[PDB]
Amino acid sequence: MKISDGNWLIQPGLNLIQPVQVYEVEQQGNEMVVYAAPRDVRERAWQLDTPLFTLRFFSPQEGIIGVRMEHFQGALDNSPHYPLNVQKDVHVEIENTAEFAELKSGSLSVRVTKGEFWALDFLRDGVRITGSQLKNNGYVQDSKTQRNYMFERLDLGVGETVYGLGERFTALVRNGQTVETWNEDGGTSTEQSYKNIPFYLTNRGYGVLVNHPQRVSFEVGSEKVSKVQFSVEGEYLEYFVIDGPTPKAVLNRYTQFTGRPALPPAWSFGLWLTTSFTTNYDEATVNSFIDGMAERHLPLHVFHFDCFWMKAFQWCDFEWDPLTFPDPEGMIKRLKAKGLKVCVWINPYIGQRSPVFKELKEKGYLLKRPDGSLWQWDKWQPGLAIYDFTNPEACQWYASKLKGLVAMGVDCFKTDFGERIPTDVQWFDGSDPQKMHNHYAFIYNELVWKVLKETVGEQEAVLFARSASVGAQQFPVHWGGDCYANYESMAESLRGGLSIGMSGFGFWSHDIGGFENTAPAHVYKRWCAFGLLSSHSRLHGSKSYRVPWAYDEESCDVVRHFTQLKCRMMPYLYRQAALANEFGTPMLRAMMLEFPDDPACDYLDRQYMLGDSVLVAPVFSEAGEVQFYLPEGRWTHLWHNDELPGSRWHKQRHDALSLPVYVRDNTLLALGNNDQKPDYAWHEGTAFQLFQLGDGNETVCQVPAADGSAIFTLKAKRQGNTITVSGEGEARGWTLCLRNIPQIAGVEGGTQAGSELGVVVSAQGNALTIS
Amino acid sequence: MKISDGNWLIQPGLNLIQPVQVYEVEQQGNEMVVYAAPRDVRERAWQLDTPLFTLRFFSPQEGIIGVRMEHFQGALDNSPHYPLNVQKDVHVEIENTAEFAELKSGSLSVRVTKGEFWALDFLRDGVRITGSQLKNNGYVQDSKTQRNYMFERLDLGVGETVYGLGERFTALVRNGQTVETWNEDGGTSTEQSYKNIPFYLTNRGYGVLVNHPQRVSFEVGSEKVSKVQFSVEGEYLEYFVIDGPTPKAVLNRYTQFTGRPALPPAWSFGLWLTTSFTTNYDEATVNSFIDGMAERHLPLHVFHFDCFWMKAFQWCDFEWDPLTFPDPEGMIKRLKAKGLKVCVWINPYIGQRSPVFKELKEKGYLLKRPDGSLWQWDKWQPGLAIYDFTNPEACQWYASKLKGLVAMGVDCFKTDFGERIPTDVQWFDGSDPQKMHNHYAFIYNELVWKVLKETVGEQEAVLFARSASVGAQQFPVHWGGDCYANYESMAESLRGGLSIGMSGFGFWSHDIGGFENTAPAHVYKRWCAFGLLSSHSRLHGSKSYRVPWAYDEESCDVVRHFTQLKCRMMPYLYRQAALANEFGTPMLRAMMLEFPDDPACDYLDRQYMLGDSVLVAPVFSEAGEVQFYLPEGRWTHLWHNDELPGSRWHKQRHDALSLPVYVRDNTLLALGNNDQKPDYAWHEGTAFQLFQLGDGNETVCQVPAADGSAIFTLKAKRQGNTITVSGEGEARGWTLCLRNIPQIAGVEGGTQAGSELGVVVSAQGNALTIS
Amino acid sequence: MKISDGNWLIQPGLNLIQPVQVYEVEQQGNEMVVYAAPRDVRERAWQLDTPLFTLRFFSPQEGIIGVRMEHFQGALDNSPHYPLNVQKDVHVEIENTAEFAELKSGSLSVRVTKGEFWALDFLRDGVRITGSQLKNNGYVQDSKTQRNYMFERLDLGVGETVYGLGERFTALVRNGQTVETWNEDGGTSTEQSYKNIPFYLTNRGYGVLVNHPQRVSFEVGSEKVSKVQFSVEGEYLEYFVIDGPTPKAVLN
């Protein structure tokens, strides 16, 4: 795969053909075409017996520029293709003068210089941000394998940092990594990633996407350190560049282009418990677990059944084991009557040991080897087979089975696996195996989501997936995978979650307490604290039950405290989720995203930002010592009320019941009066919290509704020593707690009282003034 | 080379044999031997038909532990070997109890746990810092190539950062990089490095070295992200671990183990000018350049002749071209009478087009192909041949030629190239080609240094090398190589210099203004400012003369100002160089090395620390805007006298004549009264500078002598509002300038006066008190 | 074609997967199905990521027991097939207790022992005459040719003599002969035979037939002298055992 053997020579047996000069430029409607040659062609003698690269520049969307470089147009382009939304009503400008060619869309433009010097530049309002230099857009012919490759290099300035490229557990900064996009089930410790999506982002406000479902070779910080290289097999290379003043705008544009993330239901934002994988469980075990959880005053909202709810060596057969669950319907009804939810595990792989295998083979719904046979291997299940989702009949059968299961009483499904797809197979539709290897997960997720929305509805639709591809954000619920019970594993999982958040996914989850091995105790408490502060919290294990009382009472106490805190913080999290659905900004934001202009947060990965106001720095030390950096502004702890100056580092030691969680200044948070359920009336009896309202500043807060649309808005304006608060919308009774304010010297229409956290004013109207 | 295909399976055709249990432990004098097996062997039935790994633990030096893992002892171990200093009078302790085996040396110890659980740990006073877990010390047999490999993995905690691994121009942090140690001439942009040395350091205070001159495969942050992997071909793996509270102690121990860096002469610390590479130059051109430099009041100390001082297609023949330099002796004498120095370019490669080639072939002093022939290829010179330094007669001939050249009037030599050594050759001594590929540069440098010390002397010995290996620090003068005229190239060169400094080399240099292409202007000024603040400053070009007046007068003015500043700062730089020679601490320290306890400096590479007190942040922007981070303490500019609070970031815009250079608080710097030569009496008429002497603190300063030993020491103690300064040694007249002090309210024995930078007190004695 | 390079090691590049334990037993009408695994699967941890051999025992005719061992059912089975007369009105008995599984037809029976010890026995009125021991019913994957083979070994007592295997001009007793079934016109002096039919008989009154028109590799008295080995390329192995007090009844 190596192209350059240093800086002066290249590897043997690699013919390189690169553009050196611009020959012709044409305007086809709203697109620009450039025909270039590798040598001087100004003279008539050399206008023959040479290749000719064709570069097409277009603008599928405002602020996005697509470039397609081609050598031979006689090759075949088979299905599938990435689901990209393209608009044909975009205003674009083209300037073709004797000196250069410019294609301008929105605030972005692409410039190509004619003459002896070949150069490509991308300009954001007339200033270069990146581009391609001379002899950096070559085409490679390999005689050893008789193969062809197309590679492209993009320049990098000083201080550039690359982020994204899917779920990677390596260092957050991708500089120096030879990442490759190929879905593989190799755990979390290894560089292999369950979900791969070719797209990267830079701190300067520009992002790059590659439209190639097949394998793509990436080199960031590798050979040609000052440039980022991406290469692909074939004859044509297509890639898109998205501009934006800040990374948030780039993410918004990307989410608009590839699909907006959906809004998970409110009840999904809660604690989830599973029956582990290898443990022996039955109806009595589930009942005892639920009774014990209820007795210890530990709220529970979601319950999950793992793979062994079916028969051994039978997965997936969609039939309950008679010896373990004689009456699934009665158990599901009893659980639902108790206020819980039921949701199960499925996978797109079937086992040979199953009565329905013969019928499925007869109906021809399974994947077929090229000549006449089926594809099987010694893996997760004996005689493994893969459903052929390209055949509509198989999809209909799967949908009917899922509909029956949903009618039984199920709510969501856990789409595990879906990445170890072979390539030496013949699909029913005749699609290219290389691209199907990555598109299979998207197809499966789309089918499951369609079934779920047809049965229950869009609002209650939710899933739990481990594999993903481009466009999967439309069904956003993801799980890191298999992790170990160590601090390093927690750090790697946090890094992967941040990376996937920065890659366009707005929701992420991880296994609390680890999957493999048994956690001693302290690491379990820290993992519980970290996970319960995220979008979703899951309790899943491999060999041991992940129940707090199995270790000690302190774990139960901390779990109860953190769950109560999360329930009390539901409205803010739901508002952040609605913002993520609208503008595409992930809820689990990284430090850089909130403050891209601060160089100190470029290389921060041990702490994260929740919402647009909360900062969390989970501990990773036995003694509890932890160091975290605060940007400019005064920060106040969520429940400790201490103040710390910003724009500097800080070191602190905390016990198992506390960890560094802070809120920026000039903030108006919202909380509810219910700490047991996440689906309560957020606009009834709400408590707003005022943090460090500086003079001359204004703050706003919008409590969302069930559908996510704001139902009531409150605005606070401070002038001198008087603060006026005005609210409009729908509400009945609320309180405002000014923090770090022992007392006030006057109120207008509000009943004031003191509290350990400040001054609480209950409002009998929709307008108050406090001096 | 890949071993694990994820986390559950491995690549086909790779047999893995790993230790799982400890069978026996023995004590041989001061060494420990552990015999281990891959399976349970407690029972007599399984005590046969299985392999057995042998692990030898020893302590070649205090604070260093060497581990040797072996499978077969019947293999051949041929020359050469790394020049490691081993002491046989080291006190060590061994504890062999029924539970574990402990080998303790100094403050470090190695612990191995017996029983069913195999584990290896390294303890610094009883607390683990790293080690090897189960099934991470395997041995790999590859049937495809019928090869054998030995790999070892070392654990990494949270926040670990890896540095070193030689001259690398990639990101400073090695996390996520699959570095490989193999000398190659592939420029600076590519990941290939001219000089490679297997050794890495961690921020926690422990470093690792691999004793294998042959190719070593390194994986940091790659597969098995939470571990660092190193693998080597063969049957035995040897590696050393060095402890230390801080990285500086680790560097000191490493320099003591492998060789202390030498002390370059004082005159070497000056401006160097060359006649470029491809430019046409002769005696008249050199005379005109020198006259122009003298006219513009630009001091010059060293002059260099590039490759073309010989005849074309003749290198290396060691004969002056008659058509260009008819009388080299007269020119050298004239240059020496003018106060300059003469020093030339050499390489270990000879060209076929040369009268002496036939004689050399007849004498058999050249490298030979295995059967009967010579080794040649189409490269730098036609019919290239490599001197066989393993033959003493060839070394004697080379030494005689170098002695003649030195007698002609030369001072140093520029040992270029020495990395593109083949492997399919038969050496005279019969050494292994794989190890000679890396040891050839060391052998050549050692021969040249021996000749130089025999002719001139140790004090005046100096060189200019591009290739290096383990133990080359004993002749420390290095040059980055070929760079481009861009800000990115400057950043990459700075990163490489910092990396090589952290790898055990105490001196480094780079080409100012770039090697390839012509710099516009501003970048040239910034590069001049950056280089003139380093240990050595060189003006070398490829196609254009690197003379300031060739661009504009502003470049000349800034060059003059910076050269005067460097000359005025000579004593402090020489003291830092003496410290580097003694304790091994490089002069061009990175931010982390000075403040390892500050997490904010972990990922800093655009700014560096000169000495133990100076901080420089060269600019990389056209507009002059630059952002830099200051650790705790008050910092004052070298010549602007402004104060800035520490422990935070700062942004500033500077013109071409200024850049961010600052000095920490509680500092007593020293400067000289001569700004034209670097070889003046530093202890005569010296000016000490006092920066922010806090109450209750004490500061010391030692001005060095020609040999580097301190000649005079000054100590200042502040109590309340009275500062007492006491000096002892050899000096005649000096001044002390307290900065940011407009006036004083009393002096004792010193004549006080005011100045724009503070208060200057001339001392007529060796003890003063100021209230 | 060689599988075992002696008695302790095997030839390089030959992956062997053999049944070691009985996992499940099922009764499908007049047939018995046994699902077995190469490792202990009593615990839930090892009930995955492992193969599973399927053994089907049936009785096409009174006094005859047919055994079909399979690994992958996705392979193609094209025409032709041997013209075997099969009766669907045969009285058979099945006994599935917690200790062993027995399929009895006429005077013959097949017994499989459950638990940690895997063993297959053929009983003529309750007395063993032959069977398969542990680690003798393996499946071979050859990476060199990327091929797959299924081999089966049957025990031999003292004094056993093998006869038949078609028109062979070698010694009447087949002990010590590596016969192969492949029609070839190589005269009469050479071991090659014009007519080949995979079937052998023993003096003790039991005979064995292999239902595989394709090439079948036979080893009688060769490596594993105390056993008779037959191997075939593919993924499924089917063979029938016929009882009888005397060889004449077996021939009938």
Query: Distances in Å between the alpha carbon of C85 and those of B534, B640, C88, C236, C238?
Result: 97, 109, 10, 21, 16
Helix (H) / strand (E) containing B181? strand B180-181
Q: Which amino acid is at A157?
A: G
For chain B, the C-alpha Rg in angstroms (whole number) is: 28
State how far the Cα of A382 lies from the Cα of A22, in Å rounded to an integer.
58
Range 645-704 of B in CB contact (< 8 A) with A: 647-649
**β-pair partners for A154:** A228
Angle of CA points B626, B629, B633, to nearest 5°? 135
Dig out the tokens for A609 from the structure.
């930002």
d(CA A521, CA A559): 13
Query: What's the rounded Cα separation, in Å, for the pair C169 and C179?
Result: 12
Tell me which of A7, A165, A192 to substitute to probe the interface with B (most B C-beta atoms closer than 10 Å): A7
CATH code of the domain covering residue B502: 3.20.20.80
Residue appearing with tokens 């820290």: A526
A726 close to A701: Cβ distance less than 8 angstroms: no
Most A-contacting residue of B127, B226, B494, B602 (CB-CB within 10 A), to test interface: B226
Residue of chain B whose alpha carbon sits nearest to that of A598 = B649
- Spatial CA neighbour of B645 closest among B629, B661, B631, B634: B634
- Which residue in the set B4, B169, B221 is minimally distant from A171, CB to CB? B221
AA letter at A103: L
Of A192, A223, A487, which is closest to B6 when you measure between CB atoms?
A192
Cα separation, C16 vs C142, whole angstroms = 9
DSSP state of B509: B
Which residues contact residue A510 at a Cβ distance below 8 angstroms, ignoring those fewer than 6 apart?
A479, A480, A483, A493, A497, A531, A534, A538
3-state secondary structure of A448: helix
Interface of B with A in 350-369 (CB under 8 A): none
Residues 6+ apart with CB under 8 A from B350: B315, B316, B317, B356, B357, B360, B366, B381, B384, B385, B387
The CA distance from C78 to C84, in Å, is 16
By the 8 A CB rule, do B591 and B247 touch? no
Residues 6+ apart with CB under 8 A from C172: C163
**Spatial distance between the Cα atoms of B508 and B587, rounded to a whole number of angstroms:** 9
Q: Which residues of chain B have a CB within 8 Å of the CB of A157?
A: 487-488
CA distance B382 to B313: 7
SS3 B556: helix
Q: What is the CA radius of gyration of chain C?
A: 18
CA distances to A270, A442, A478 from A413, rounded to whole Å, are 16, 15, 12
Q: Are A504 and A515 in contact (CB under 8 A)?
A: no
Nearest residue to A737 (alpha-carbon basis) of A639, A668, A660, A642: A668
As beta bridge partners, residue B593 has none
The residue of B154, B417, B488 whose CB has the most chain A CBs within 10 angstroms, and thus the best one to mutate to test that interface, is: B488
Helix %, strand %, coil % of chain A (to 5)? 20, 30, 50
Beta strands in B196-329 (DSSP E): 199-202, 207-210, 216-220, 227-233, 236-242, 271-274, 302-304
Alpha-carbon dihedral B648, B649, B655, B657, rounded to 10 degrees: 50
Instruction: Please tell me the distance from the alpha carbon of residue B513 to that of residue B506, in angstroms, as a whole number.
Output: 23
Give phi and psi for A765, each to the nearest 5.
-140, -155
**Phi, psi torsion values for A201, nearest 5 degrees:** -130, 155
Beta carbons of C51 and A385 less than 8 Å apart = no
Lookup: tokens for B240 = 């050393």
Least Cα separation, residue B655 to chain A (angstroms): 19
Helix (H, G, I), strand (E, B) or coil at B574: helix
Can you tell me the distance from the alpha carbon of A290 to that of A287, in angstroms, rounded to the nearest whole number?
5
Residues in contact with B8: Cβ distance below 8 Å, sequence separation at least 6, in sequence order: A185, A186, A187
Contact B53, B71 (CB under 8 A): yes
Token pair recorded at residue B102: 């402990």
Annotated active-site residue B432? The verdict is no
Which amino acid is present at A485? A
Q: What are phi and psi of C147, to 5 degrees?
A: -115, 170
**Which domain does B583 fall in, by range?**
266-588
Looking at beta carbons, which residues of chain B come within 8 Å of A601? none
Separation between Cα atoms, residue B238 and residue B70, nearest integer Å: 9
The pairs formed by A36-40 with CB atoms below 8 angstroms and a separation of 24 or more are: A36/A118, A40/A116
Q: What is the 3-state secondary structure (H, E, C) of A342-368?
A: EEEEECCEECCCCHHHHHHHHHCCECE
What are residue B148's DSSP bridge partners? Answer: B141
Is residue A456 helix, strand or coil?
A: coil
Provide the number of CB pairs (under 8 Å) joining chain A to chain C. 48
* Helix, strand, coil percentages for chain B (3-state, nearest 5): 20, 30, 50
Chain C contacts of A308, Cβ < 8 Å?
Answer: 44
Q: Is C146 on the interface with A (CB under 8 A)?
A: no
Environment class of C12 (CB within 10 Å of its CB; exposed 0-12, middle 13-18, buried 19+) = exposed
Active site residues per annotation of A? 416, 419, 482
Q: What is the 3-state secondary structure (H, E, C) of A538-555?
A: EECCCCCCCCHHHCCHHH
Under 8 Å between Cβ of A333 and A341: no
The set of residues, in sequence order, having a beta carbon less than 8 Å from that of A502 and lying 6+ positions away, is A163, A164, A201, A247, A251, A586, A590, A593
Which residues have CB under 8 Å from A499's CB, separation 6+? A163, A164, A165, A166, A167, A168, A172
Residues of chain A with Cβ-Cβ distance to C44 below 8 Å are 278-280, 308
| Closest chain A C-alpha to C72 CA, distance in angstroms | 6
Full DSSP string of A647-687:
SEEEEEE--TT---EEE-SSEEEEE-S-SS-SSS-TTEEEE
Q: Can you list the positions of beta strands (E) in B361-503?
A: 385-386, 413-415, 464-465
Residue B489: closest C-alpha in chain A:
A226
Give the 3-state DSSP-derived string for A689-748, with helices as H, strands as E and coil as C. Answer: EEECCCCCCEEEEEEECCCCCEEEEEEEEEECCEEEEEEEECCEEEEEEEECCCCCCCEE
B767 CB contacts (<8 Å, ≥6 apart)? B724, B725, B726, B727, B749
A643-644 β-sheet, strand order = A588-589, A608-610, A614-616, A661-663, A635-637, A643-644
Between CA C209 and CA C238 the distance in angstroms is 9
H or E segment to which residue B531 belongs:
helix B522-532
Please give the angle made by the CA atoms of A613, A616 and A622, to the nearest 5 degrees. 170
- Please report, as a single letter, which amino acid is at residue C52: L
What resolution (Å)?
A: 3.2
CB contact set of A752 (below 8 Å; sequence gap of 6+): A744, A759, A760, A761
Contact A379, A446 (CB under 8 A): no
Q: Where are the beta strands (DSSP E) in B266-412?
A: 271-274, 302-304, 341-346, 349-350, 385-386
Tokens of A126: 């007339």
Is B699:B668 a contact under the CB 8 Å cutoff?
yes
Is A170 in contact with B225 (Cβ distance < 8 A)? Answer: yes
**Cα separation of A570 and A679, whole Å?**
9
Q: Which phi and psi angles does B608 have, rounded to 5°?
A: -140, 170
| Chain centroid to CA A606 | 18
